[PDB]
């Protein structure tokens, strides 16, 4: 326990600098916000890779049978309306009921960050190639 040294005085013309810096940090933040809203909505609106992990069942099965039949003829329209976002996709599968208890229990789904890739994604590197200038919390393309 030593007596606390006194803090030096503030600065000369640092009040102006702090005002200006915060001022235009805010002005910048307006466009950063505008842009990230644009990005967020563009992502919600655009298609995604299929959410289910095909390495497990009932998904591994050849695309001409089983769950894929159930999807092509009964669920297709809906699955496309929600753009294969993993949350509504999993919910639709619960509500189709012809799988029923399996969706959470036997079936496996891709992890969050992989399931969020844009449809067409070929290489894994894509997760890291999305824009970092934008504040969407990984909800941006």
């Amino acid at each position: 326990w030593a007596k606390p040294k006194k803090r030096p005085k503030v600065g000369q013309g640092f009040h102006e600098k702090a005002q200006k810096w915060r001022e235009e940090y805010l002005l910048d933040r307006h466009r950063a916000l505008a842009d990230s809203l644009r990005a967020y909505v563009e992502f919600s609106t655009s298609k995604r890779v299929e959410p289910w992990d095909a390495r497990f069942k009932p998904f591994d099965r050849i695309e001409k049978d089983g769950v894929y039949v159930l999807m092509r003829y009964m669920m297709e329209e809906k699955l496309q309306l929600c753009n294969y976002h993993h949350r509504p996709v999993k919910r639709l599968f619960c509500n189709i009921g012809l799988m029923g208890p399996q969706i959470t229990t036997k079936a496996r789904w891709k992890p969050y960050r992989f399931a969020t890739n844009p449809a067409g994604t070929s290489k894994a590197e894509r997760m890291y190639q999305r824009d970092k200038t934008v504040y969407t919390h990984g909800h941006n393309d």
Binding site: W1, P4, R7, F14, R22, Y25, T136
Partner: protein, 142 residues
């Protein structure tokens, strides 16, 4: 404390890096209060319900002479932009003014429009030792 930045520098001990129970730290220092989120824009560091009324602090409650700064939990309202009146807030070193009015501010609290910890640093509020330690962390050039 080592350096006294206020009176309390004399009264308080740091106790090293000490753990406090969850969400009670004696001093409320909201470093995160401006922390950009597009999707969470209306739920983060704002009212939990959009049907809540604006706080006390958006209203003139009593007979006033006038104020120096308005509180930082005051929420920015279309009139803040339009009326063209002084809107000040107490930040450090002194005060932050909203000078350049934008509708993009509207509906958020000024907590959220004022960056608490600036990327800007005064070299003149720093000891030569402290300046050294800020060069080590790769903040100040030298």
């Amino acid at each position: 404390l080592k350096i006294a930045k206020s009176a309390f520098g004399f009264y308080l001990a740091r106790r090293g890096q000490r753990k406090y129970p969850f969400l009670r730290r004696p001093h409320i220092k909201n470093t995160h209060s401006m922390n950009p989120s597009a999707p969470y824009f209306w739920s983060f560091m704002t009212a939990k319900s959009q049907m809540a009324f604006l706080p006390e602090e958006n209203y003139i409650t009593g007979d006033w002479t006038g104020k120096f700064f308005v509180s930082k939990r005051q929420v920015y309202t279309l009139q803040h932009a339009t009326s063209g009146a002084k809107v000040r807030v107490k930040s450090f070193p002194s005060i932050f003014e909203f000078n350049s009015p934008s509708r993009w501010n509207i509906g958020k609290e000024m907590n959220t429009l004022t960056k608490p910890r600036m990327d800007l640093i005064d070299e003149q509020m720093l000891t030569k030792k402290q300046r050294l330690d800020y060069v080590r962390a790769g903040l100040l050039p030298k």
